[PDB]
Amino acid sequence: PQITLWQRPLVVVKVGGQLMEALLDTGADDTIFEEMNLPGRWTPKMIGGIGGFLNVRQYDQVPIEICGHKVVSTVLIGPTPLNVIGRNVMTQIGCTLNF
Amino acid sequence: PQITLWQRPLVVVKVGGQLMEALLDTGADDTIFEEMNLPGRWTPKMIGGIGGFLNVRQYDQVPIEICGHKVVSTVLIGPTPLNVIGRNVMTQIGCTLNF
Numbered sequence: 001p002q003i004t005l006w007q008r009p010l011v012v013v014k015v016g017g018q019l020m021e022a023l024l025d026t027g028a029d030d031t032i033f034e035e036m037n038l039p040g041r042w043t044p045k046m047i048g049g050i051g052g053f054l055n056v057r058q059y060d061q062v063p064i065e066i067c068g069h070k071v072v073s074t075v076l077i078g079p080t081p082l083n084v085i086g087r088n089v090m091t092q093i094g095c096t097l098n099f
Numbered sequence: 100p101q102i103t104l105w106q107r108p109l110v111v112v113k114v115g116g117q118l119m120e121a122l123l124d125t126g127a128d129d130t131i132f133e134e135m136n137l138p139g140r141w142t143p144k145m146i147g148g149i150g151g152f153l154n155v156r157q158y159d160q161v162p163i164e165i166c167g168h169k170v171v172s173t174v175l176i177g178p179t180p181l182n183v184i185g186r187n188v189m190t191q192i193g194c195t196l197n198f
């Protein structure tokens with residue numbers, strides 16, 4: 001559906017077997033969540049934004065469930081003060097900006 | 100106009116009599132640009148980003164032109180790696196998420 005921006009655009013997500021809230025975030029190329037146990041192998045990744053940079057772990061082809069949409073996506077795990085749904089996932093649910 | 104998210108949602112902005120590019124950023128509460136001279140008084144502000152917390156100058160009631168739209172908004176100046184158009188500006192121009 002359509003979402004205004006008077007409040008933060010938080011949505012409920014399931015990943016991979018856990019429930020989280022995350023921010024629909026058009027300024028993020030990538031999807032990043034707080035420390036949680038994703039299963040399997042990961043590759044080290046550094047990313048930077050406002051206030052500096054973190055070391056994150058990149059998990060590929062992680063099932064994510066967002067609203068009614070199931071997708072399989074790359075997911076970074078590392079310190080973020082908020083879970084963020086990035087363009088890599090939003091494109092897959094057909095999310096656009098409009099004004 | 101509708102904007103897909105296959106690419107970063109950059110827009111051209113006029114702010115403080117200067118032209119720049121910025122990201123339409125639904126994950127940002129506030130609007131923040133790289134160091135530039137905005138005229139007048141300002142307040143020190145803490146933000147925290149992915150890597151934050153950090154030191155920024157808050158300028159109130161700054162003229163901003165984006166996509167035809169002229170708004171007057173709070174604008175933060177500080178060492179961000181991309182200029183960011185936050186929800187405080189996006190709501191004024193009527194920007195929504197859709198899917």
Ligand SMILES: CC(C)CN(C[C@@H](O)[C@H](Cc1ccccc1)NC(=O)O[C@H]1CO[C@H]2OCC[C@H]21)S(=O)(=O)c1ccc(N)cc1
Nearest residue numbers: 027028029030047048049050082126127128129148149181
């Ligand atoms: C700064 C952007 C260019 C990129 N950021 C996404 C952005 O939407 C963050 C996303 C974000 C949101 C909250 C907390 C941490 C990160 N928002 C943000 O920094 O907003 C700040 C300005 O307004 C305030 O509102 C919230 C924080 C403040 S980011 O989280 O740092 C980021 C950086 C690198 C990658 N690869 C992916 C994401």
